[PDB]
Design a protein around this ligand. Structure first.
Ligand code: GTP
Ligand code: MG
Ligand code: MG
Lengths: 38, 360, 100, 29, 86, 283, 553
RNA sequence: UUGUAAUUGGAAUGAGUACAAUGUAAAUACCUUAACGAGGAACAAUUGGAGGGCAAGUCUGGUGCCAGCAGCCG
RNA sequence: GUCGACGUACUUCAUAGGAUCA
């Protein structure tokens, strides 16, 4: 049977691993896209 | 009903030849008298590999494991991953896949994991610079063996990706009735989890033996370190003598054990390379079985290959008998007209084999 | 039309003979495959190159027979200058004194 | 679970087809 | 004359597309490979790999159209007035 | 600055480099990194020399979080000034201003690369590729051909570069010769310099210059000094003997009346050997 | 341009080719038999009162013909003659005109590889007006041209006198056959086949009585081989059309029973150095390698371990090191890298040939280049076969075409021996490995244009793949814009549709035809060729799917 | 007062068949002509081009119900 | 050898201007 909409994503261990590796990579070089005072 | 064989001798060849021919076979009395009878762990793994790349095949292993019934199906190929047991290296499993890959419905894309070198089986370089070059001569235009990670014994940990993009109806008819002229000597001296000095010393040793020759010598130094270097220290050398005129290559390989002098290994492989050349006419002994099998499965024409008498050994005779048992083909040998050497021409009529699995 | 290619020249050899004779009389005033030609050209070039290589090897050997260092010799880069400063004169004097 | 597998599966089929169309059209012209 | 190597647009999803009507043909006279049109996908069924095809002048870049296959006119086949001899 | 945008030529350059999977590649003038990513795809590891820190940072950002990230290494500095690591292949799209030094540096590396794919402007590449007797045959051609072999890969036009430059470009292959031929670089270059001041004149006329006579006489005196033979050192002591020596060698070699632009490698080697025989050392 | 074609290989032997099979096919009562008798008389000057089964006759100095009268009322025969006949003499009743059987055979021949076709119109003496006779000839000829080709030769026979046709036309027909040449067809040049000339049961009658007639029999079949050479070793799988698949128990060659005059002259020529009709139904290492009794180690020592160990056996390192202290004895293999100048030049010329000879080493057209490569390989085959001895040659290539052979089959059904009619031909065909396998066949199929009714899914259909005829249940499908394989209820009226069925596998590109009715009782008046197609793929499984809709409110 | 007829009435005729005669060296054919020869006049004119419309059908894309491709397949 | 020059055969980029109306 065809599906009409995207399924709700599941947070499996691999997804969490990839996300935390992403965060560690970003923070290693201090690559933060944060608001800067004008 | 079944063509019956005896013993574990030529286990891979008999299974492969059955698959190409489509003829069901039975292999019985496999290590009956041994304390541990039946198939080894790696033998079963090879059968698992055969099942992955084919569809419709039926394999029965007897309760005691000393008899195998193999009813081959069509070769289909595809993408798959195979874990090679530590008992055998990847080369043990890659070598038979070369025979079946070019005649498959879909491209072979197999990732072999395990030990990447051994003292008795084909190394990574032996396939890359020693066997696929023979395949290219037979019409397999594009084929590659990528070395993602090296794994030396005993812990291994290596990874190699076999891709055979060429799909062909059958090998081209071979016509090689001369002794190729060797133009240059190349080679690869690799090491893992060790200092670079070993690879340099191995290259030093090989250069000492080969210096008197009259062709250029250039041996690559491929020192692997880090995450891709595997789990155990290891180092080996592969020397290839290349004949650029017709694209023929003769190779000798070996690896070093702990405590062995790197220079001695380099000298030994260099000496072995010269021994292979003196014994070879058109192809080396280790490349000979692949050449003969490909000739057998060519178009229904007479292919000629020059072979030195030194190549006609016990291994050659048993190979021909297995081919005759499965294919009913007979290799006709005639002496060459020349007198300087005692070479002979092996004339093989192809069986008219064709790759019917491929879709049009 | 006189000397055009014929379908079977061998079958009319005598005819061909006449043509040759005619040419020899007509063009007497002047006389008084791709692969094959290219192969001859490359063979000639190859033999010439190999002879040049052997000559070069012999000359380089004889050069090793006659070899020295080049630190003290004045480079030919000085050909354009034609006049030297007192710094250069002092440097030359010091170098010559070191030579003795 | 099956819904996620189908969408992931259909994604690869579409991506390969679009890439495999692109190669063919490039060759012809 | 030419030899049909492969039908490039056999797999294209949109029916009767311009791509679907192209066939990759090898010119027998010189061996150069060229692309040729077929009148419609219905005719594309008749054309298969390794038949001799007679090409004539006509997706830009395709300058040839098939007029005969195996010595029989495609229009004759398309109109169900002849059978392709094999 | 001029930046290439044609992908076909970049693919061709990387392919014709013929990078073995066990090759370490020196990539000069990284720029954005269109070549660098592909070189990383098929190389053991890449060492890059970048002058602009901003461009190096952008390249690092591009390669971050990719399987080839550990392979890349970036050196910051001026390529000529830096002391470089061992590399098997050179692939450069560096600014043409350092074209000539680069080449010779590659020639004089302790272990020269087996192959290099270099882009130059059309005139410079043609002068590199020039053969004896050609119009553009020059000192560069003779010197490089003695130390290497240069072949033409492709012609890169103006339209490929944005903004368009005023000069057309070409990719050539440089293959340093191993083993290095055994001739002193200084003496080879000195002879060529003396003879190539005007390449379409007679070589004798090349040696007629008074400053050339002065240099050769000083060299002769120094040579006599090194051999422990006593030499007067006056300005015009040895002018007449050196003139006679030059005349005799030029006559016997039969090269006095041959234009430098029409003389090949062996002719200059013969002249060098003759001058060494009679006792004149150039550099 | 019209000279250019697809390069192919012709497997006809260079020496002693087999006779050409001439099938006289036509509706009942058209004059097939009287044609054969008239033709045979012209070439051999003797009249055959009765003809049954194949008849081999000498037609020239070095040419022979095998005449076979196809049973007019059988469709199964018409299929298998069509797969082997080199020439087809198509009989048409001029007064009546075309009939369905004539059209049915042509369509079978067109789909299975069109052979040479000669139209022969008879009964023209029945016409009463010369004008209407010419009109019928013109209409008959043009209709015939559409099927076969434009300008096809069509012979006209007026009346039968003494059971023979007029002499003049038979002379014209006889010459036309003589100068004829035959195309290379893909199927016939890839498989070995043979039309049985005579049939013999070798079963010992004692076994017939002790066990009874029901016992399976051993049979010997004699005839000329055609197509590719048949392997000499027994155990080859062959399919006898209308019987089943058997294995060659024994095979052995016999003297040619109808030698051509050129062959007898040549044979008698050898005798110096030291019949026109045949209608029966009417220590050398090479040897040591193939002595299995002698162990391989025993063999090696007489004229002077396993492939698991890829690395070849080598001598000890110290012994090798001493052996290779000097590089001599292999200097020949490696490149070299006032009178002596010539010696240098000869060396350099040799070096040049090795380095660049391959690059440099013409035919006008690419077609001629391919035909050059094919002809060169056939030349190399002939040279080698001449070199090997006759016993060795038969061992290597097998029994080449033209050989008169005896083939013995075991476990043959008794019904074949009992219900044996010499009129029906017995066609044996070799089978390639793929023919043995059974599985799902994916094909492109379309309803035949002249067939009245469309075909239905899971509706029995008699398919003719290769040498074999069999009934299956196909499922007609569609691509759904190359997304899924959707079951169709019926074939499209006027276009192709993918079809899947279970049966013996065969190589792709193999054309086939399908029929629904083969019995004469159910023939009726409509066209019996129901489907045509080409097999696209062979597989063990298929994923046909059908639309199922759920209905609610 | 326009269009459509597997509606309908009885008159005309040759394509074809054919006594015959003419034709021709003998024939075929033409020109003549007894007797047959018409409603689907099935005694069944062709070759190209343009434009539609239809579905509980199929594919692709997305500022919802739409658009494109197309549709012998429901 | 993705070599140079020439010969031959093709591809491609440069089209809008005036007047009225909103
Ligand atoms: N008048 C006339 N009779 C013919 C002609 N050809 C055949 N016949 C007759 O047709 C009858 C059958 O001839 P056959 O030779 O038996 O034809 P067939 O092919 O053998 O027929 P079957 O064996 O029954 O299948 C014979 O009586 C012949 O005289 C012809 O041109 N004219
Ligand atoms: Mg009959
Ligand atoms: Mg008329």
């Amino acid at each position: 049977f065809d599906r009409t909409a995207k399924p709700v994503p599941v947070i499996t261990s691999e997804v969490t691993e990839s996300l935390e590796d992403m965060i560690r990579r970003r923070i290693q070089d201090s690559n933060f896209d944060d608001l800067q005072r004008r | 009903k079944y063509t019956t064989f005896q013993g574990s001798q030529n286990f891979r060849l008999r299974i492969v030849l059955a698959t190409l021919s489509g003829k069901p076979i039975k292999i019985e009395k496999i290590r009956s008298g041994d304390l541990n009878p039946g198939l080894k762990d790696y033998e079963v793994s090879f059968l698992r590999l055969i099942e992955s790349v084919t569809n419709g095949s039926v394999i029965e292993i007897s309760y005691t494991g000393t008899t195998v019934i193999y009813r081959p199906g069509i070769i289909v190929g595809g993408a798959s991953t195979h874990i090679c047991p530590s008992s055998k290296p990847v080369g043990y499993f890659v070598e038979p896949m070369l025979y079946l890959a070019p005649f498959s419905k879909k491209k072979f894309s197999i990732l072999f994991k395990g030990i990447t070198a051994s003292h008795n089986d084909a190394g990574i370089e032996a396939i890359k610079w020693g066997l696929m070059p023979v395949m290219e001569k037979f019409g397999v235009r594009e084929c590659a063996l990528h070395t993602l990670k090296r794994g030396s014994p005993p812990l291994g940990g290596g990874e190699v990706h076999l891709v055979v993009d060429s799909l062909i109806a059958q090998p081209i008819t071979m016509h090689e009735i001369d002794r190729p002229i060797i133009s240059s000597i190349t080679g690869v001296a690799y090491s893992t989890r060790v200092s670079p000095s070993l690879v340099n010393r191995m290259i030093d040793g090989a250069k000492k033996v080969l210096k008197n020759l009259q062709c250029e010598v250039n041996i690559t130094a491929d020192v692997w370190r880090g995450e891709n270097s595997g789990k155990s220290p290891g180092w080996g050398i592969t020397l290839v003598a290349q004949s650029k005129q017709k694209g023929w290559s003769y190779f000798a390989e070996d690896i070093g054990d702990a405590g062995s002098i790197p220079e001695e290994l380099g000298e030994k492989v260099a000496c072995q390379l010269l021994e292979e050349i003196s014994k070879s006419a058109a192809v080396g002994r280790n490349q000979l079985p692949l050449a003969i099998v490909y000739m057998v499965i060519g178009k229904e024409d007479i292919g000629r290959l020059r072979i030195n008498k030194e190549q006609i050994d016990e291994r050659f005779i048993i190979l021909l008998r297995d081919i005759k048992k499965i294919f009913n083909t007979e290799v006709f040998l005639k002496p060459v007209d020349e007198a300087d050497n005692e070479d002979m021409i092996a004339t093989i009529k192809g069986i008219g084999f064709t790759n019917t699995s491929k879709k049009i | 039309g006189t000397y055009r290619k014929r379908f079977n020249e061998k079958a009319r050899s005598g005819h061909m003979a006449k043509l040759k004779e005619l040419k020899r009389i007509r063009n007497k005033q002047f006389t008084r495959s791709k692969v094959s030609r290219l192969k001859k050209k490359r063979l000639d070039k190859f033999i010439e190159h190999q002879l040049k290589r052997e000559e070069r090897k012999t000359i380089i050997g004889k050069l090793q027979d006659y070899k020295i260092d080049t630190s003290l010799l004045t480079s030919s880069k000085r050909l354009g200058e034609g006049r030297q400063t007192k710094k250069e004169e002092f440097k030359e004097a010091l170098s010559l004194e070191r030579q003795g | 679970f099956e819904a996620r597998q189908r969408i992931e599966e259909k994604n690869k089929e579409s991506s390969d087809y679009h890439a495999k169309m692109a190669h063919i059209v490039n060759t012809i012209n | 004359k030419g030899i049909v190597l492969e039908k490039l647009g056999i797999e294209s999803k949109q029916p009767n597309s311009a791509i679907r009507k192209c066939v990759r043909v090898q010119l027998i006279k010189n061996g150069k490979k060229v692309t040729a049109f077929v009148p419609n996908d219905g005719c594309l069924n008749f054309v298969d790999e390794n038949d001799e095809v007679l090409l004539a002048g006509f997706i830009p870049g395709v300058r040839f159209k098939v007029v005969k296959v195996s010595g029989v006119s495609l229009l004759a086949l398309w109109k169900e007035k002849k059978e392709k001899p094999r | 600055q001029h930046i290439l945008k044609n992908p076909l030529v970049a693919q061709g350059i990387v392919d014709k480099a013929q990078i073995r999977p066990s090759d370490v590649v020196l990539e000069v003038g990284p720029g954005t990194g269109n070549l660098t990513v592909r070189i990383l795809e098929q190389a053991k590891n890449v060492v890059a020399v970048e002058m602009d820190p901003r461009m190096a940072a952008e390249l690092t950002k591009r390669v971050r979080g990719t399987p080839v990230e550990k392979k890349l290494e970036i050196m910051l500095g001026d390529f000529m000034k830096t002391e470089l690591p061992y590399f098997d292949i050179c692939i450069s799209n560096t600014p043409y201003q350092i074209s000539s030094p680069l080449v010779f540096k590659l020639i004089n590396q302790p272990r020269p690369p087996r192959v290099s794919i270099l882009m130059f402007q059309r005139e410079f590449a043609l002068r590199l590729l020039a053969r004896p007797g050609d119009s553009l045959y020059c000192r560069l051609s003779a010197n490089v051909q003695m130390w290497a072999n240069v072949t033409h890969i492709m012609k890169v036009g103006k339209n490929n570069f944005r903004p368009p430059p005023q000069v057309e470009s070409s990719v050539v292959r440089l293959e340093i010769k191993n083993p290095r031929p055994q001739v002193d670089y200084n003496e080879w270059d000195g002879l060529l310099r003396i003879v190539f001041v005007r390449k379409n004149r007679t070589i004798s006329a090349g040696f007629k210059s008074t400053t050339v006579m002065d240099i050769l006489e000083k060299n002769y005196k120094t040579f006599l000094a090194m051999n422990n033979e006593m030499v007067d050192d006056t300005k015009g002591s040895m002018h007449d003997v050196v003139k006679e020596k030059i005349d005799t060698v030029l006559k016997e070699t039969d090269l006095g009346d041959k234009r430098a632009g029409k003389c090949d490698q062996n002719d200059f080697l013969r002249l060098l050997y003759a001058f060494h025989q009679v006792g004149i050392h150039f550099s | 341009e019209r000279k250019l074609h697809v390069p192919m290989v012709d497997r006809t032997p260079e020496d002693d080719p087999p006779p050409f099979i001439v099938a006289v096919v036509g509706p009942p009562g058209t004059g097939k038999t009287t044609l054969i008798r008239s033709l045979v008389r012209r070439m051999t000057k003797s009249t055959l009162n009765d003809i049954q089964g194949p008849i081999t006759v000498v037609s020239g100095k070095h040419r022979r013909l095998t005449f076979l009268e196809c049973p007019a009322d059988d469709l199964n025969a018409m299929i298998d003659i069509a797969k082997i006949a080199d020439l087809v003499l198509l009989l048409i009743d001029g007064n009546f005109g075309f009939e369905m059987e004539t059209m049915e055979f042509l369509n079978i021949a067109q789909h299975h590889g069109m052979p040479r076709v000669l139209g022969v119109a008879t009964h023209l003496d029945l016409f009463k007006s010369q004008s209407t006779l010419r009109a019928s000839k013109k209409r008959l000829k043009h209709r015939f041209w559409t099927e076969v080709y434009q300008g096809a030769k069509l012979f006209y026979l007026s009346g039968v006198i003494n059971g023979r046709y007029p002499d003049r036309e038979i002379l014209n027909l006889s010459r036309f056959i003589s100068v004829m040449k035959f195309r290379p067809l893909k199927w016939r040049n890839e498989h070995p086949y043979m039309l049985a000339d005579r049939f013999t049961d070798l079963t010992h009658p004692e076994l017939i009585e002790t066990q009874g007639l029901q016992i399976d029999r051993k049979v010997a079949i004699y005839g000329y081989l055609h197509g590719t050479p048949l392997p000499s070793a027994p155990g080859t799988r062959v399919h006898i059309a209308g019987v089943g698949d058997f294995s060659v128990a024994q095979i052995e060659k016999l003297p040619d029973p109808c030698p051509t005059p050129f062959y007898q002259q040549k044979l008698d020529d050898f005798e110096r150095e030291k019949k026109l009709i045949y209608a029966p139904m009417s220590w050398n290492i090479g040897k040591l390698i193939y002595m299995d009794n002698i162990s391989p180690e025993e063999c090696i020592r007489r004229w002077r371990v396993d492939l698991e160990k890829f690395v070849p056996y080598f001598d000890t390192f110290e012994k090798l090191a001493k052996k290779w202290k000097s590089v001599d004895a292999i200097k020949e293999r490696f490149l070299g890298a006032r009178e002596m100048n010539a010696a240098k030049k000869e060396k350099l010329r040799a070096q040049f040939e090795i380095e660049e000879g391959e690059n440099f080493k013409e035919y006008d057209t690419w077609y001629e280049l391919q035909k050059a490569k094919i002809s060169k390989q056939l030349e190399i085959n002939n040279i080698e076969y001449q070199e090997m001895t006759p016993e060795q040659r038969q061992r290597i290539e097998g029994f080449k075409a033209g050989s008169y052979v005896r083939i013995v089959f075991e476990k043959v059904p008794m019904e074949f021996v009992k219900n044996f009619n010499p009129k029906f031909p017995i066609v044996m065909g070799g089978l390639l490995p793929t023919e043995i396998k059974f599985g799902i066949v994916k094909a492109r199929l379309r309803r035949h244009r002249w067939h009245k009714k469309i075909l239905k899914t899971n509706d029995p259909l008699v398919l003719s793949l290769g040498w074999r005829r069999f009934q299956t249940l196909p499922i007609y499908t569609t691509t759904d814009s190359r997304t899924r394989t959707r079951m169709l209820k019926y074939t499209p009226e006027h276009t192709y549709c993918n079809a899947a069925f279970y049966g013996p596998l065969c190589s792709p590109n193999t054309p086939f035809c399908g029929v629904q009715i083969v019995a004469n009782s159910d023939t009726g008046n409509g066209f019996r060729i129901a489907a045509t197609g080409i097999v696209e793929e062979i597989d063990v499984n298929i994923e046909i799917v059908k639309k199922l809709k759920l209905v609610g409110f």
